[PDB]
Amino acid sequence: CDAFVGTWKLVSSENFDDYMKEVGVGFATRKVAGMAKPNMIISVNGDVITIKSESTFKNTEISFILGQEFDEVTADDRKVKSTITLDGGVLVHVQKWDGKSTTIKRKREDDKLVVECVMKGVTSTRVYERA
Numbered sequence: 639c640d641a642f643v644g645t646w647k648l649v650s651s652e653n654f655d656d657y658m659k660e661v662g663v664g665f666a667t668r669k670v671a672g673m674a675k676p677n678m679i680i681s682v683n684g685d686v687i688t689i690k691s692e693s694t695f696k697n698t699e700i701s702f703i704l705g706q707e708f709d710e711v712t713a714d715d716r717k718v719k720s721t722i723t724l725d726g727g728v729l730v731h732v733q734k735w736d737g738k739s740t741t742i743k744r745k746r747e748d749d750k751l752v753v754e755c756v757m758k759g760v761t762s763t764r765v766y767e768r769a
């Protein structure tokens with residue numbers, strides 16, 4: 639995961655409100671979450687990867703081993719079963735809850751870390767650069 643490790647700042651967002659709607663996030667949480675622009679930190683220690691926020695909305699921190707399911711409480715307070723794998727150089731994060739599923743892909747492209755959040759047919763793209 640070397641090219642992912644670091645501190646990343648949000649530079650652009652498209653369709654994130656629509657993504658959150660499709661996920662089922664309520665109005666007030668969408669408004670506050672949509673404004674929040676924390677930097678996102680990826681660190682690695684051995685086989686354990688950590689993804690952490692620093693948010694004005696809600697701080698989060700997940701630690702995991704690739705391929706191994708874990709419990710995650712998302713920023714919008716869903717309790718999900720998550721699995722994150724590294725597929726062709728892309729981190730692929732699947733969240734399962736209440737019979738539903740969403741996938742978040744994170745990939746390096748040029749000097750960007752591009753996050754693609756997909757819920758059914760809705761995709762949001764959020765672009766980060768090194769802080």
Ligand SMILES: Cc1c(Cl)cccc1OCc1cc(=O)n2nc(-c3ccccc3)nc2[nH]1
Nearest residue numbers: 646671678679680689713714751753764766
């Ligand atoms: C905030 C939120 C709500 Cl309320 C609801 C559903 C999904 C959400 O976030 C999903 C989501 C949005 C986003 O901007 N990022 N940025 C990263 C990222 C960027 C660089 C390095 C590591 C991780 N991961 C995500 N995941």
